Amino acid sequence: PAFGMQRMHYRNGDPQTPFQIAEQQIQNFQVANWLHFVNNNQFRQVVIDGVLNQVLNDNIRNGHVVNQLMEALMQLSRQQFPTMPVDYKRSIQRGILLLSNRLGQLVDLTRLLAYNYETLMACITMNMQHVQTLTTEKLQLTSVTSLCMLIGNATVIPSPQTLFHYYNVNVNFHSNYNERINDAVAIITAANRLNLYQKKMKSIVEDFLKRLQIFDISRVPDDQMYRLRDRLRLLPVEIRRLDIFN
Amino acid sequence: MDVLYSLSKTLKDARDKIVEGTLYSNVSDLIQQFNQMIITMNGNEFQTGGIGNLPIRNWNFDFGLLGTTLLNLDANYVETARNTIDYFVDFVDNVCMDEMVRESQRNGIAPQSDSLRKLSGIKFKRINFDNSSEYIENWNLQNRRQRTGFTFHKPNIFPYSASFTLNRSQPAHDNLMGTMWLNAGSEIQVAGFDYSCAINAPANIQQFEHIVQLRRVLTTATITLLPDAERFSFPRVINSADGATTWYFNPVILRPNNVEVEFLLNGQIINTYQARFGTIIARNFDTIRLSFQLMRPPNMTPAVAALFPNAQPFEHHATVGLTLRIESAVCESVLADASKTMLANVTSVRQEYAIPVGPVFPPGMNWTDLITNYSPSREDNLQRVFTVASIRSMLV
Amino acid sequence: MDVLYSLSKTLKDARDKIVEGTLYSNVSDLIQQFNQMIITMNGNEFQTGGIGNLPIRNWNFDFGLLGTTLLNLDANYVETARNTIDYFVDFVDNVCMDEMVRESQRNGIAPQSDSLRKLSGIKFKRINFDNSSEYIENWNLQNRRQRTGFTFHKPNIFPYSASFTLNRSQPAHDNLMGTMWLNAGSEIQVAGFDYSCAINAPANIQQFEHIVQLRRVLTTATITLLPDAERFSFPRVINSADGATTWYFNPVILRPNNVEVEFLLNGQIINTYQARFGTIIARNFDTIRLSFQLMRPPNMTPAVAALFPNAQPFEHHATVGLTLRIESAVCESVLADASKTMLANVTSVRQEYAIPVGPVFPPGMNWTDLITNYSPSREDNLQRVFTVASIRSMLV
Amino acid sequence: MDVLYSLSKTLKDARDKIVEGTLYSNVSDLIQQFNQMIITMNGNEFQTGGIGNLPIRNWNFDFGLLGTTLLNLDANYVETARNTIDYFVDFVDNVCMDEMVRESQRNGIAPQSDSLRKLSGIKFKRINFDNSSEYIENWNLQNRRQRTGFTFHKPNIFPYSASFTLNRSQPAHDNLMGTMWLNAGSEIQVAGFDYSCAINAPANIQQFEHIVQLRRVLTTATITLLPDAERFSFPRVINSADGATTWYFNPVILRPNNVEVEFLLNGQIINTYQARFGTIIARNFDTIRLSFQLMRPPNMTPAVAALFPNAQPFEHHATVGLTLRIESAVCESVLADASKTMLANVTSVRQEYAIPVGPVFPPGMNWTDLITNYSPSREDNLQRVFTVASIRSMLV
Amino acid sequence: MDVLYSLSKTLKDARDKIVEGTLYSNVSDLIQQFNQMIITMNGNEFQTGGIGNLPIRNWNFDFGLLGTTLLNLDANYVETARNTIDYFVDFVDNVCMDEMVRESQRNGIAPQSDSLRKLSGIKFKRINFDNSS
Ligand SMILES: [Zn+2]
Ligand SMILES: [Zn+2]
Ligand SMILES: [Zn+2]
Ligand SMILES: [Zn+2]
């Protein structure tokens, strides 16, 4: 509406997002460049100390891209909105300016968010695998507005004790995960090598999941239980447990 | 054709008017027309070439609109417009070249290239806007069948012909009476020669006539008529009519007598000029009749009387002449002229890409052959290619 | 240059469109552009210099805006607009004159006058609007390094030269073989003469060749080629090559034989025309090679045989000719032509104010000297002055 | 062109800077530019090579990005980057080869290949970054029409020419006076020979002149001038001017007298050096005029007197020589030179894939013909292909 | 000399790197150096002398800073930068020419022209950066 363009008739399932179409269909450099960034600002994958990490574009980390955002929406504040009623147009442009005039605060907020993310991600010990989950965390855009319009200039970083506690919890969870995998694999392999054909590996997998401490085993689908059994079967036994079994 | 011309005109206007620092009020309507062009051309695939050495080129259109708000145009706006205009201009040039190299005996006025045929669809009519050029204006008028008028400076209406007619002749070619002419471009030089100087002619007058039939009717024509034909007034060795031998011509120039220039339409005298030289007007004609007389001077000085004896040998041959130059005219059909470059453009495009000789035009687009046999199909194809050439000239 | 052209264009539009009784909607955009020009020029002091006899003139701009209140323009509005437009037109004409009379060897394309140099500042970019003239179009294309094109009717590409070459000669000049040519403007007339009429030639054929090198590349050229060269077809008394004596030429015109007109680019044959006369097209060339032959007529009537004996004296000298006129063409560089008045305007401005000879152009603005040594510096300066001359001619 | 250069520069910087163990701060900007290149190229389909034996190749981009938060690069990071770098280098090399084998007469400066034409789109402009090479800098300045020059070590400005001129000669070629020269690359060796040793010449001085016209203006040129021509200082048997017979040359070298070298621009004396040998500077010139003299030694020892008798036969032929070597220079146009490999790269690419001869360059990319007819269109195409060749040599 | 070389180097880097479409990360330090040069040169009057036929030229510096806040450089940015760069390049070329035509028997290693002597003051030392030639 700002550029007098016909409203997009977007088709669901299109391999392009609406912003990807708008980037090609919009000629203004400010808005087009901001759209290009928003289109291509996915996580980057990098292995640090053997841990896979999802890292941000350097322009997010330093907060510079917010300027581009400002640029883009500053242009939106100067646009005619050809056929829009003038009072609604004024309200939209004044909201755009409400966000625009907080350029310094938004750059500071972006840098703070990126720094906090990096510092807390340094404490992650398991690979940060990006998968579209079944359920989501619902984020209210009103909360985003609150964060954008109420952030000041008070830097808040994780406390060293908070970082150490987070790292300790992650290490404990990872170590327990590996140790319970080892126990389950050892027991399954012993049962198979002892020719205990009436043994149910389902009970072993249930005990393993229960010892992982974060699963309500009653709500685990059966196909996933059997897939877990198969994958546990395919693993080799840990050296200490295997020697004891020998 | 109107859609192609409108594309070219919109691109020319965008090049000329979309410049850094100009007020947006100077381009608002132009920007809307440009956006309409973009919308209409978006999502369409075109192919040009595939004939002669002209390369196959594929064109896809996915461009955004110019919707930025400004008081004065800046560098960003001009660069975006420049990119879009460059792509569109390349497409239009290729389409014009593709259409300029094609011809058909049937429906030669209709589009021949696939790109122009697709552009002739209804969905592209939205691209159409101002059609002010002479050639597109004439195209639209002819489609409406109103009188169309192409104004030519020195129209190329006479096919080249340096010829002669011997009304009296003999194998020795020493006592000849006849006419020799050059009809080239907009110029007609004619010269009637009598070797005997009308010594035995009735009343000592010899009459010469030269009829030139124009292939198309010319109107509102300005003509310069001069008594003498400088081309046929020097000693010359001319081949025989069948080329068997050569004869000698040794002119002595006498002023033409009883000069009558008649401009005829359908055999009827539209204009007549008697003993009038300089600038004359032929308002509507398809034929020129130049009648002039070699009159033996009744009184001669001894030097003059020495040139014209009573009998052979005749060493000096009495020649009268006429020069007729069409400075400007108007024709309902397209023609080559000294001021325009459409014939040159079409010929260059056909020669550069080695277009094979087609079934309509003569080889190399030789203008003499084309205008010697200016058939209606040839006229239609020539008008099509000339309009396309002008459209291309707006950009290239 | 773009700002100066835009000033002139705005003034021309104001003169043409601000007329009594006209609807304001006919001038709204024009009035906005004119007021933008007024705003941009206000508060600026300009000076047009005293080079030559041009008076030193100081220009101050303190004008109010044109009104926007009348539904139809009345007499008072037209009078006020006329006053402002007269002052602005005087300023623009003086700036154009001051620019035309200046030249530079280092940067001839850049502005030379201080007023135009000031107008090249960014603060004046607002004045810039529609650039639709051919010369300004080519200026803008040249600045971007794009294919420029100037269309010339009868381009003045050949420097004047009436010369002859004697391939066979002797002190008494009674047995001469050679060529005499005139190269002037768009016209070439060449004539090869043999006094023996190729009696002792290897096959009774005498070969003549004329090479004319164009100082610039010409494209899309319409060219009339005629057999005879009327300029070298009458008796003449011609100075010797060293001026020590005078010799006699008594042409008798024979039909040129094996006429080959080659249009060459970089020494390669771009176009070739054998025995073709009338209108031809040279699509891209920088050199012309006219090869023709004097062929002794194998069969001669008694008079023709009488003209050409087997040995000296040779009283009649066989001559073959060729005329080559460039009716129209396209050149990437600026040139003087029969239609445009740029050279005339620049020369008139320079002569009126007694401009001292500079280090670039010949000391008369003489075209033969300019085109003979058409250097890149000369080309840059000539393009600049011609563009300014067109800008001035829009108003004056 | 700028986008292709930026791709090549990004790939070169990725090879150089993305190394194991390097601080991320050493590559942060480089990694950002590399990711921008990946993002821009992703999802785009390219086709290269349909001319000569250059095979058709199709290129698709679906590559991943590179990390941005690690402190030091490790072997995993480099391994991740290397496959993408290899594919992109292959794509860029093929695009450069495709563009190097193409030419056009209309717009030789504009891209010719389909891949480079697509890269001219606005969306790829984001890939553009530091244009610091000499050729790309000249490209960008020349597009803006700014004064920019290429610096050449031993510029290849003189087309090969080993010729002689005889001012005094006769059928037996025993008493000759004239000059023999070799023009090759940056070298001019000229030798004026007199068989009579100026015995009868006025003041016993024989003057020799040699004019060499450079096809392009050389500026800020260092020249080594030596007073002998070793090439023309030993006995030779030389064909006649028409190849009908061979004559004998038996030089005896006398030092040149009154040596004057005039470096001229547009017929104006820019630099003049008299009796100066060693290093000289020619700041701006297009013509070299070497004037030298053979002076008889007024006093001769018995052997020297025996060499030069008062009359024929002349068995020892006096000779004076000059050697001129352009060590370095600056030219606004691209030239082959002893230091760069641009001409070698273009010729190699054209030969390896059997590119058919086009309408711009001479067959085989012959440099002598190319510099003999160095037209503006040839200059445009040569600059384009040389810039592409430098871009390719950045990676290959 | 180091200040003059740094001016020329900054201008060459600006001409090579400030191009349409380039990421600002490719020019951030260059833009900082360019703005430092503008700040240091603003308000200073220079004169390149009239030795021989070299014209007397006067140079005044009042230029705005090059902008930040762009993710990719656009055409407006490049145009403004080109205007400033053109003026600065003309100034630097004239200063170099003025210094090239002068000489002194003693202290000939020191600057000779007034412009370079002014540039040798402490206040212009801020312009100095990478000396790699
Ligand atoms: Zn005319
Ligand atoms: Zn006959
Ligand atoms: Zn003579
Ligand atoms: Zn010889």
From Swiss-Prot, chains B, C, D:
GO terms for molecular function: host cell surface receptor binding; metal ion binding; structural molecule activity. It is found in: Virion. Zn(2+) binds at residue 153. GO terms for biological process: fusion of virus membrane with host plasma membrane. Keywords: Calcium, Capsid protein, Intermediate capsid protein, Metal-binding, Ubl conjugation, Virion, Zinc. Ca(2+) binds at residues 266, 286. Residues 62-73 are annotated as: Interaction with the inner capsid protein VP2. The N-terminus is blocked. SUPFAM superfamilies: A virus capsid protein alpha-helical domain, Viral protein domain. The keyword Phosphoprotein does not apply. Coiled coil: none annotated. Pfam families: Rota_Capsid_VP6. The keyword Transit peptide does not apply. Intermediate capsid protein that self assembles to form an icosahedral capsid with a T=13 symmetry, which consists of 230 trimers of VP6, with channels at each of its five-fold vertices. This capsid constitutes the middle concentric layer of the viral mature particle. The innermost VP2 capsid and the intermediate VP6 capsid remain intact following cell entry to protect the dsRNA from degradation and to prevent unfavorable antiviral responses in the host cell during all the replication cycle of the virus. Belongs to the rotavirus VP6 family. The VP6 trimer contains a zinc ion located at the center of the molecule. The zinc ion is not essential for either trimerization or transcription activity of the DLP. Zinc-depleted VP6 has an increased sensitivity to proteases. Homotrimer. Interacts with the inner capsid protein VP2. Interacts with the outer capsid glycoprotein VP7. Interacts with the outer capsid protein VP5*. This is Intermediate capsid protein VP6.
